[PDB]
Every structure is written in structure tokens, then in C-alpha cells.
Design a binder for this molecule. Structure first.
Ligand SMILES: NC(=O)c1ccc[n+]([C@@H]2O[C@H](COP(=O)([O-])OP(=O)(O)OC[C@H]3O[C@@H](n4cnc5c(N)ncnc54)[C@H](O)[C@@H]3O)[C@@H](O)[C@H]2O)c1
Ligand SMILES: NC(=O)c1ccc[n+]([C@@H]2O[C@H](COP(=O)([O-])OP(=O)(O)OC[C@H]3O[C@@H](n4cnc5c(N)ncnc54)[C@H](O)[C@@H]3O)[C@@H](O)[C@H]2O)c1
Ligand SMILES: NC(=O)c1ccc[n+]([C@@H]2O[C@H](COP(=O)([O-])OP(=O)(O)OC[C@H]3O[C@@H](n4cnc5c(N)ncnc54)[C@H](O)[C@@H]3O)[C@@H](O)[C@H]2O)c1
Ligand SMILES: NC(=O)c1ccc[n+]([C@@H]2O[C@H](COP(=O)([O-])OP(=O)(O)OC[C@H]3O[C@@H](n4cnc5c(N)ncnc54)[C@H](O)[C@@H]3O)[C@@H](O)[C@H]2O)c1
Ligand SMILES: C[C@@H](CCC(=O)O)C(=O)O
Ligand SMILES: C[C@@H](CCC(=O)O)C(=O)O
Ligand SMILES: C[C@@H](CCC(=O)O)C(=O)O
Ligand SMILES: [Zn+2]
Ligand SMILES: [Zn+2]
Ligand SMILES: [Zn+2]
Ligand SMILES: [Zn+2]
Ligand SMILES: [Zn+2]
Ligand SMILES: [Zn+2]
Ligand SMILES: [Zn+2]
Ligand SMILES: [Zn+2]
Lengths: 346, 346, 345, 346
């Protein structure tokens, strides 16, 4: 087998029966124990035919954890039964970025026909999944799979975004988190674990602001036209050292530019087509850098797993069966999952 | 004493006779040996009455070198006759940024009424000038004052911009320099001295491309619509690790976005009101950060001076008298100074 | 004031009456609200006549907080009544290190005759004290002075030592803290606040191990011959990413070398004359760097103050009067102050 | 095939005929084009029987370049004929260090029985060699193999040592290089290429001081009792920002401690059993860190190759045949190779 696939442009994903794959040389077959739903899946399924490039059908799910079921020829660095998380943004493994584990920034992958699981290659929303190479597996030991699956993107992506500017986030700093969803609720917790920043969370929804306080935000601010003034009141007029925008709409990016401090940072993490920061003199403070980060690195995924194993990340989830996969995507689309949706096969 | 002042909104600067100042407690009086002209002075003098905030009259010149003439009460660490460069972007000296020498990013200066020489306080285009505090002087020893004056902004600003991302500029990297004027011709030389980056220079003017090659650029490319494709051809389709845009027009920022590499950097250094980078998904590569840097730090100015003393910077200048100051500004406006204009008071 | 001074080589410090100073141009007079005792004061007072270089008499105390009492001529940026901490390791203010606020690493100060309060210039163990320049004052707002005074060295020094290698201390890292005294008990708390490192504390004294657990250590291990094996058991045989040795005896440095990981770090912070790490092939792991850090930077002191104001540092103190100053030093010498001794004028 | 092997404890290496190997799955067979001699080979061959752990016989050579001769089953990313350099310090590929390319600091390799070529596995001093995995090959394009072979250790090791502290080596800094041999003569050139440090070279031999000046040292100091005072005279009494000791004898480490600046660095790179820095209060300046670095990282090797391709490294070599291999080791032992000895098979 059972899997959840995107099969027709503009249609909802469907539950299918397809062959259980067998690993070729160097590949590993996992029995999937948990598969996370990411809002990027919604954006992908909303692409018109002219833009959509991942092929049909596509087994969804780029947040995957499992146990090693079968080793392909020549694979010996894992044993059958090992609990592993899948490193998602597969790169070529050979370029200068990849040599540093920064496969998220590989520029050679596309030309070599290397695509990530759930985003061009078959994903984790299935009873079993293939992983191309052992370097794309990270051990998780006895971590609960349901809470582990989101670490692979909801954890990894905020972790990487924060890591890019961690030296800015010393005692006395303030970090703003915009969007307390799958990514944002983990982002707050990463900030608390790896920095002494004061954390201000921003969301449209009072229940998400409650979630933010539950996971350790120091303050919670309603998003929209009043947010910039409210944040500036909290920061004593100086603004926020860093803003991590997990929404990335034009309104939230505007809020971010209106509150960022001199020599601070805006990380535009959320993906809303057309929205952008306007980085120019008189439009942003001196020295305030802006970036659109993507995914994270191999060693960053290991660090996220280490945070989880140390008890520093309380991942808020709701569990679904494979048969409930399409229903779960409807819930994600409408904004009614408090945290991360996770499919648990069987 | 003789000085060059901006005295009337919309009018050319004029040569004046005003009193030689006397240093109060903590201040230092310099006999000016060289005063650099910066294109920012043109932009300032082009501001309409409603925007112009630096007061009239204003003695111009924020690139200053001199010899210590008189010590104000309680000043130590300098003797009469010492050759010094003036650190330009005065801050409060007390905040967290200033404590690190990063007075360029002080947020307290404005509210305390602290303004820089030539940009709210009296500048260096005069026989003598006041410096507010000893911490705003850096010794230059026997460096030629004419070539030293530009170090204080034409050197400092590119040096800071490059320093923000120096770890990116390893062997195999490429740095693009857009605009081979006062700042840009120094920026090329800094890149060559402190990194192993391949340097590609870009300018509208073929004589400035020649200047770029003279000061060590590896390649020089005509600016305009064909520049992005030409740069991409030189970088093997991978793009440039970093782009230092010393023009900052919309067209040059667009060129920068079209050539920057994944996980690279654009530094928008030149100031053209309204121009901005558009930093959003699908509009810039993943991981490519963008910033508008401002001036530089105390320790950075010392490092620039150290480069000059080591013979690493060939500063291209043309010398003017104080009486020629207004004529020199006309030359700067029309683009006919090959490098930096420098006034030498007699 | 009344002051406590070291007055005679080899003798205990004494309570004295000396003139209240007046600030000259650029100086600030503080009314002292709290003055910390540091174990370095013991080491200084144990120096023989041939080594001791700070002059007699010396008003002790290089951990100082106060309120601005008088401004010297030309001083700006502070008002009378402002609560401030004194930045201790005064530098020249002009060199490349000082320009970055790294006055702790100034090499010009000695030749210019610049000495720190309590260590060549008059210290904070007195009703009033002089500060040379406004850049050596950091505002503390409404922070309790008793808990604030130790921030200026018990806080600053561990903070700097940790900061030198903070990028190593990611999730999955382990930091060992040897010596849970004035410095060490703050070091544990800094590690918890600014990193995700697992913290293993080491001390001779079971009550100090309890203190370590109270302030957030993940494990606390008895020092001595068994400590290295115990630490290696806790780290799965891989050793510790960083070791912060706040004792710095040969035995503790040896423990540090026996537990540090490949590509890790040993910070020798505690001062024991003659003791040293042996950094050579076959004697330490590949890539494991070793340093003796000193004090900290201007911006680091500001950051320490920010941690305290945010409630991230529970500074364990015992309070003494000026008259009790000599008794407090005897207590420090014998090891009976649980945390930091602080004199309140 | 012909090879040079260490075959008997305490005896000179010998030229042998042994079978040409065949690559198994994931392995690559190279036709060797150049094999560097490293002084570590001398130290290894001087180990008594009780210490020597690399097995007999051992094909020597841990500096290897070649062309791809045969691909083992499942190998991708290289074609037959590709010119490649061998990354020497093989790690497990999977741990946190290896995920960052830092296989030089892998702690899992020993327990997994992973040993480097020339140092437990068969080396490059042979007509052909096996490489275990594609990730241990770096393309060199048309670089001359003779000058390329030393990049793999004589280049890599100094490059890594310098890289650990590159942010210290700003304009105005001084770097001391002790020992102008295989590693040291490359170290000087790396410092000149990637920093603005003033470079002071130190050697016992006047001809090696001449070599140092030939490759870009600013100053040259005779090693021994007068070296520390001479270096301090050159640095104005302040001492050297960093000392890279490629000898690592007690006398050179003592020199390094006597000249290092406050908040500087000593890198003990050369290996002399028993010698060590004494890092304690009153024995070294405040803030001066000391480390024994080992080899370098995957991305560092790529950077070294990039320096060579850009013309930044003039590698001084002497060429030997395989039959001359033992004679070349005698020359290395006696100190008569001016730079790096390189064996060029058939
Ligand atoms: N850059 C990357 O590599 C990367 C990786 C993964 C996901 N993403 C993107 O991150 C974004 C978030 O993904 P998710 O799975 O956490 O989404 P989610 O649907 O789980 O959460 C969205 C959250 O944002 C809040 N929100 C929406 N509009 C808002 C506004 N105007 N102001 C404040 N809050 C607002 C919602 O109320 C909700 O709490 C998506 O755009 C996704 O595509 C990016
Ligand atoms: N960010 C800061 O802190 C800071 C500090 C100093 C100066 N500036 C700004 O930097 C800019 C440069 O100042 P300068 O004094 O070196 O100027 P300048 O007049 O000396 O040099 C301008 C150069 O840019 C070239 N140029 C102009 N338009 C171009 C285009 N479209 N493409 C390529 N080249 C082009 C010119 O031919 C000339 O060589 C100005 O905008 C100035 O205000 C900024
Ligand atoms: N590097 C610097 O700039 C700097 C600055 C300030 C203080 N110091 C030094 O730091 C050291 C500590 O100062 P303090 O004021 O915190 O001392 P303290 O007397 O308050 O505490 C000492 C602690 O170390 C423990 N201890 C002693 N020997 C031990 C051993 N062998 N193993 C484990 N634990 C042991 C004690 O039980 C006690 O808890 C002193 O040497 C002091 O001079 C250094
Ligand atoms: N740390 C590592 O990862 C690593 C890697 C490779 C090599 N090494 C070691 O680096 C060292 C250098 O190797 P190499 O192949 O360049 O050696 P080499 O024999 O080619 O060069 C030695 C050089 O050091 C000089 N020298 C010797 N004694 C000296 C002294 N007392 N003072 C000043 N100069 C002196 C010689 O005159 C010669 O120029 C060796 O100990 C080697 O084992 C270490
Ligand atoms: C479609 C989207 C996927 C991001 C993700 O991995 O969540 C992207 O490629 O930008
Ligand atoms: C007025 C202008 C001055 C920049 C400069 O210092 O050259 C600015 O601050 O934007
Ligand atoms: C013998 C030495 C080898 C270093 C090298 O690779 O040159 C070591 O591993 O200790
Ligand atoms: Zn996703
Ligand atoms: Zn790649
Ligand atoms: Zn300017
Ligand atoms: Zn300031
Ligand atoms: Zn102390
Ligand atoms: Zn100084
Ligand atoms: Zn070697
Ligand atoms: Zn490994």
C-alpha cells in the first residue's frame, strides 16, 4: 504494498496497491515506521501541469523513518532491523558542497538525474521505501518513529536556517519565529536548546500561539498589521536580532523587514511564490542579511536527532493510517493539524 | 582657515574662510594632510531640502588623514606630529556593537546626537579638523597621506563587505566586483590580498576595465545586458561565489542575482535609492545571502592600513588643492576621476 | 572610608581606614554595592616578596559592582545613581585587540602603566572605588548587586573560555567541567544556557557535586584517579568534546588529556604554577587544541550580565561585611564557601 | 607489476614483482602516474617490531595520483582515463566527522579495520593501486601528475593546519614556518595564497632558507638558539600570530613557544616522538592555543588542487623511477631532496 500517490494533476492523492520494491546494488529497503506530511506537498500538488516536474505517479512523503528490511548488494554498514531516518535532499556525493555533507546545496544532482524521495523519487508514504545509498541513512536508536519522522524536514530545515546565523544569537538577542506549524513549533525548541535568544512567536491563530508557549516561546504575538509594533514594543525599540519566517508570505516578510535589527538577519524559510524581501538601502537596516535557506546538511540531521534523543524536542503530531493519507492532506490544506501530520503504515 | 562647504540646498559647494577650531576636552585637532572625495557626497548634495538632514553649512569630507596638531584636555595615546587616519562612522562607544569596535552598526549614535565628520559634523576638506575622541584615530606612520585618505572609506567599506563573507572565498571561488571606481578598484586588491578568489571586474567604461586589470582582476567584463551571460561563461555555468556590487543600481543588482551561485552572497554596497535585491524563492538561488553593508569596524580600518603599509594596495588618485575642491566634485559627478579624488590642503 | 587591604607580604589582609578618593578627569567614583572574593586573591597573597608586583598596600577585590557616585570632569554616558559592573582587565583601548573589546589580550597595558583594580590599582573591597574610564563600566539595571559582583570574573572567565570553542559544542557534544567552585558552578550554567552540550561535572567534594546537579549538570563524578575512566564510561568511549579545567592542577590536566575527544578542546582555566598540558603526538588526541584563556572581553561581560538579567544564572553566594573580609578570605582558603564569597559595604 | 615494499623490520624497502590487483565492488583501480615520498615513511620504517602495526609486506606511498584504469562493480562518477588524486586518510564515511568530509578525524576507522594506502593498505609506489571508494578520488584534470602527487599530503596537511586558524591571519599578522621541506615549502605558498600574513621561514640549512625565499617567504631565519630572538626582532617584540612547526622537535616547539603572540597559535605538525608543547600559565602566552593537527579534509584536498590549478603552488620535486625508490628513500633520510621526492612508475 500500500502507498499514497499523487496520480493526476489537480486531483487529490490516492491510496494505491503497487509492487514492493527490491533494492539494487548499494540501495537499502526500509520498512517504513513513520512518514511525515509537509505543507510543501500541498504546494507541489497545486502546481499546474506546465510547472509540475516530479513525474506521475509519485509516492508522496519526504519525511521518512523506518527499519532496515533488506540490504542491496554490497551494503554492509547497517544491519537488518536498524532504526534509521532518511536524509532527504539527495546530492551527488562528490562535489565540494557534498564533500562537506551539504548535499542540500549540491548543484550537480539535477544533471545526474538524482531526485529526492517524495519529490521525484518514490517517498515514504508507503509500507516500504528504497534509499539510494547508505550515506543517506542516519541511526535513531530507540527514538519513537512518530516523533522522529518530522525531524527529517520540520526539524532539519529550521535547524539549518538557525545554524547559518547561530553566532548572532547570544545572550541579549531576540529571535522572532513567524508561523507556529510543523516547522515553526520545532524552530522555537531548537532556538531554546542551542541559544540563549529570547523567542517571540507570531501566528494568525490563538491556538498556535498557545502551542508556541507550550514549546517554550517567551512571548506570542498575533500576526498581521499590528505585529511589527508589538514586536518592537517587546524588543525595546531595537528590533529583533533574527527573524525566522516559516510562512514567507509578502505580509510576513514585510513584518520581518520592519522589525529586524541593524546587523541582524531574516531567514525566509516558508515558500509563497512571488513573495520576496526587498533588500536595498532605505528599505532594510544596515547589515541585516537575508537568505532563502533550503533543507539542511548531513551533520545537521545528526544534530537534530541528537537533540531529540536528549529530550530537547517535543514534537507535536497527529497519527494517520495509510488509508487516511488523503484525508490527512485535506487536514493539512485546511490548517487543522496541531503540529505535524504523520502516517504510520499498517 | 580655508574649507570647502555645502552651504545652500541644490548649489555647488564653495570655498570659505571659517575659524580654525580649538579642541575641547577629549578632542584632537588635526592639521589635514589629505581629504578624499566620495561619490556619496554627490548623493548627499543632490538630496532635496526635505530629506537633507546634515545641517548647513557643512564642511565636506569623510575621508580624512592628518597630523596631530593640538591635544584637547586629558587626551593621551597620541603626540603632536603623529600621522593618523580618521575612523569615519562614529558611534556611541558603549553599546554591544561599539564594544566590539563595530561603531558602523551602533544604534545609539543618532539619539545621542553623534554624527560623522563630513556627514553632520565638520569634515576633512579644510586646513584643520576636530576629531571627537582618540579611539577615532588610527596611526599610519610614514604612509603617503594622499594614498592613505581613501583607505578610510574607499578601503574600509569594501574591506568590511568582503570580511562579512571571507570564509566563502576559498580556493576555487570567484568574486565579481561591479563598479571599478574609488571603492571598486580598492575592492579588487583587497580580494587578491586576503583570499584566493578569482576576481572578475565589471564596469561600463573600457578604461575602468583596464584599471581593473592593472590592479589585479583576473577578467574584466563590460557591464549591461550581456554581463550576466559573460560572467556565467567565465564561471563554467556555476556562477559566482560572491558579487560585490559597488554601483547598486537596479540593473547591476539584477546582474548580481543572475550570476550568484547557490550558497553564495551578494553585497549591495553602492547606493542608488529605490534599487533593491528581490530575495525570495524562485528569484534567487538557494542559500545565496544578500546584505547592504555599511562602512566598517575599527579593527578593519587598522587592517586596511596594514595592507597599505605592506604594499598590497595601489591606490589610484588625482590630487586637488582646496581651491579646486568644487571643481573636483564636478569631475566626480561627471565620472572623470580615474580612482579617487584627494584634496591636499596647503 | 573602610577598606580591606593586603599590607605585608605573607600576612593576612587587614581592615583599614583610608581616604575616600575623588575622581580626576575621565574617571568615575562608584559607591561599591558588592565586591567578590576570587581564589586568585589567595594565590596573589601567597606570592613571595620577589614575585609579588602589585604594590603595598593594595585594596583587594577585582570583582566589583556599584552605583555611580561622582563623575570626573568630562565624563558622559552615565548619570549619578546608575548601577554598573566594573570591567576588570583594563587595556590600552587603542590596539587591535582593544579595538575589538578584547582588552584581556592587550599587550600594551603594562608598558603604559595600566593595571586592573584589585591587582595593581585599588580594588572594590572598600566603600568606594575609582574606575579609569567610562568604557570600563557596564550597566546592570536592577540586578541584585550581591549576585552581580561575581559576574565580573566568576562569570566572565568561564564565559570567555566557553566562547572560544562554542561552535564545537553542538547537540551530541559533551563538556566536562572540572572544579565546581566560584567559576565552575557558573560555567555549568553558561554551558546549559548557550549550548546543547551534555555537561559532566567533576569535583573532590560530594557537596559540590550536589551543587553541580542543582545548577544543571547531567552527571557529576568524583575527581581523582578514577575520574577519567568514569567520564569515558559516560561518553561511550569517545571522550569529551571539551574539558574546562577550573582547577588546573597537574592531576586535573592529566584527567583532561585522558578524556578529551579527537578534534576537541582543553581549556586550562585554573591556575596552579608549574602545571601544564603536554601537547604532542602520542600524548594527546589528533586535533585536540589546548589553551590557557584569561579573563574575557567587553562584549562578553555584557553577555554575562544579559544571562543574569534573563534568570539563566543562579549565582550561589555567601555575604560578608567589610569587617568580615579577612575571615571570608580564610574561608575561601580552607574551601568552605559554597560558591562565591561576596563582601557588601 | 612492479612495486616498492617495506618487507622486513629494520631493512631498507625493496623493489618487488607482485600481482596487478583487480577492483572488487565499489573499488577503483588506478594506473599510478606519480607517488610522493613523505618523511613519515622514514619514521614508520624506523619503528621497532613491537610498535610497527601496518603489516608486512607493505607497498609504500600515501601520496598518490593516477588515471582510472578499471571501475569495480557499481562504481559511478568516474570514467576510464580520468586523472585523479587519492584522498589519503580514509575514514568510515558515516560518522559525524566523516559526514562533514573530516575523515582525518574519524574515530570509527580503526575498529572497522579501515587503514590508509601506504600505511596499512597497499600504497601508490607501484604501477597500479586500489582505491576503496569513489569518495576518495578527487579530479585533477590536466595538472602535471609529478607536481600533483605531493598535494595529497605535503599540500593537504599544511593546508588543514593553516585552515584551522585562518581567521587569525589577517593583514598585519605574522606566520612562522619551521622546516622548509616537503610540507614546509608548500605551507609558505598556501599562507601567501589564502592570507595576508607576513611569512617568516626557519630552517637549519641555508639552502632551504633560499628555497623559502624562492617560494615567497618574506624573511628567513636560521633555526637554533638564536631563532626566537631573531623572530621577535622581526615582529617588533610582539611575537608571531601563528607558528606552523613542520619539524616538531623539542627545540623547534620551544622556539615556537618563545615567539608566539598573545591570543596566537602554535600548530605542531612535524612528528618527533616525545616532543611536546608545555601549555600552562607562565609557560605560554595567554590565549595562545596549541594543537597537533592530522592530515586534512575532503573539501580541503579539493581546495589544494584548486590552488594548484590556479598557478598558486610551485611544487619543488625530484623524479625517480620505481627501481630508484629505495635510493630515493636514502636521499630523503639524509636530507638531500630539495622539496619532494616523487616516483613516476614506468
Ligand atoms: N525552505 C525549505 O527548505 C522548506 C522545507 C520545508 C518546508 N518549507 C515551507 O515551510 C512552510 C511551512 O511548512 P509547514 O509544514 O510547517 O506548514 P504548516 O501548514 O504545518 O504550518 C503553517 C503555520 O503558519 C501559520 N501561518 C499561516 N499564515 C500566517 C501568517 N500570515 N502569519 C503568521 N502565521 C501564519 C499557520 O497558522 C500555521 O501555524 C511552507 O511554506 C513549506 O513549503 C520550506
Ligand atoms: N555602503 C557604504 O557604506 C558606502 C560607503 C562608501 C560609498 N558608497 C557608495 O558606493 C558607490 C561607489 O562610490 P565611489 O565613490 O567608488 O564611486 P565612483 O563614482 O568613484 O565610481 C563609480 C564607478 O562605477 C562605474 N559604474 C557606474 N555605473 C555602472 C554600471 N551600471 N555598471 C558597472 N559599472 C558602473 C563607473 O564607471 C565608475 O568606475 C556610491 O553609490 C557610493 O555612495 C557606499
Ligand atoms: N584564567 C583566568 O583568567 C582566571 C580568572 C579567575 C580565576 N581563575 C582561577 O580559577 C581557579 C578557580 O577559582 P575559584 O574562585 O572558582 O576557586 P574556588 O576555591 O571557589 O573553587 C575550587 C573548586 O575546585 C574544587 N577542586 C579543588 N581541587 C580539585 C581537584 N583536584 N579535582 C576536582 N575539583 C577540585 C574544589 O572542591 C572547589 O569546589 C583558581 O585557580 C583561580 O585562580 C582563573
Ligand atoms: N601531522 C601530519 O598529519 C603530518 C603529515 C605529513 C607529514 N608529517 C610530518 O611532518 C614532518 C615533515 O615532513 P616532510 O616530508 O616535509 O620532511 P622533509 O624531510 O622533506 O623536510 C624536513 C625539513 O625540516 C628541516 N629541519 C630539520 N630539523 C630542523 C630544525 N631543528 N629546525 C628547522 N628546520 C629543520 C630540514 O632541513 C628540511 O628542510 C615529518 O615529521 C613528518 O612525519 C605530519
Ligand atoms: C517543493 C519544495 C520542496 C521543499 C521541501 O522539501 O519541503 C521545493 O523544492 O522548494
Ligand atoms: C550619506 C551616506 C554616506 C555613506 C558614506 O559614508 O559614504 C549614507 O550614510 O548613506
Ligand atoms: C606515521 C604517521 C603518518 C602521517 C602521514 O600521513 O604522513 C602517523 O599516522 O602517525
Ligand atoms: Zn518539506
Ligand atoms: Zn554534489
Ligand atoms: Zn563615502
Ligand atoms: Zn554604540
Ligand atoms: Zn579572579
Ligand atoms: Zn590594547
Ligand atoms: Zn605523509
Ligand atoms: Zn567516520
Amino acid at each position: 504494498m500500500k502507498a499514497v500517490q499523487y496520480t493526476e494533476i489537480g486531483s487529490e492523492p490516492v491510496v494505491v496497491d503497487i509492487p514492493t520494491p527490491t533494492p539494487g546494488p548499494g540501495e537499502i529497503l526500509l520498512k517504513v515506521t513513520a512518514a511525515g506530511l509537509c505543507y510543501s506537498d500541498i504546494s507541489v500538488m497545486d502546481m499546474p501541469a506546465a510547472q509540475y516536474a516530479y513525474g506521475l505517479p509519485l509516492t508522496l512523503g519526504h519525511e521518512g523513518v523506518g527499519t532496515v528490511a533488506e540490504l542491496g548488494e554490497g551494503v554492509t554498514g547497517f544491519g537488518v532491523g536498524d532504526a534509521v531516518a532518511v536524509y532527504g535532499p539527495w546530492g551527488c556525493g562528490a562535489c565540494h558542497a557534498c564533500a562537506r555533507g551539504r548535499e542540500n546545496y549540491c548543484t550537480r544532482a539535477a544533471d545526474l538525474g538524482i531526485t529526492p524521495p517524495g519529490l521525484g523519487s518514490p517517498g515514504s508514504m508507503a509500507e516500504y521505501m528504497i534509499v539510494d545509498s547508505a550515506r543517506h541513512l542516519v541511526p535513531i536508536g530507540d527514538l519513537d518513529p512518530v516523533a522522529a519522522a518530522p525531524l527529517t524536514d520540520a526539524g532539519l530545515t529550521p535547524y539549518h536556517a538557525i545554524s547559518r546565523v547561530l553566532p548572532l544569537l547570544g545572550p541579549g538577542s531576540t529571535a522572532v519565529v513567524i508561523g507556529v506549524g510543523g516547522l515553526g513549533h520545532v524552530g522555537i525548541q531548537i532556538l531554546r536548546a542551542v541559544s540563549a535568544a529570547r523567542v517571540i512567536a507570531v501566528d494568525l491563530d490563538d491556538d498556535r500561539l498557545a502551542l508556541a508557549r507550550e514549546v517554550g516561546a517567551d512571548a506570542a504575538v498575533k500576526s498581521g498589521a499590528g505585529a511589527a509594533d508589538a514586536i518592537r514594543e517587546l524588543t525595546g525599540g531595537q528590533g529583533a536580532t533574527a527573524v525566522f519566517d516559516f510562512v514567507g508570505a509578502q505580509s510576513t516578510i514585510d513584518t520581518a523587514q520592519q522589525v529586524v535589527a541593524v546587523d541582524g538577519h531574516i531567514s525566509v524559510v516558508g515558500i509563497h511564490a512571488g513573495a520576496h524581501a526587498k533588500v536595498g538601502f532605505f528599505m532594510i537596516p544596515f547589515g541585516a542579511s537575508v537568505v532563502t535557506p533550503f533543507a539542511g546538511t548531513r551533520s545537521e540531521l545528526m544534530e537534530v536527532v541528537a537533540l531529540a534523543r536528549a529530550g530537547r524536542l517535543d514534537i507535536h503530531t497527529e497519527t494517520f493510517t495509510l488509508d487516511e493519507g488523503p484525508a490527512a492532506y485535506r487536514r493539512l490544506r485546511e490548517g487543522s493539524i496541531r503540529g505535524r501530520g504523520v502516517v504510520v503504515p499498517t
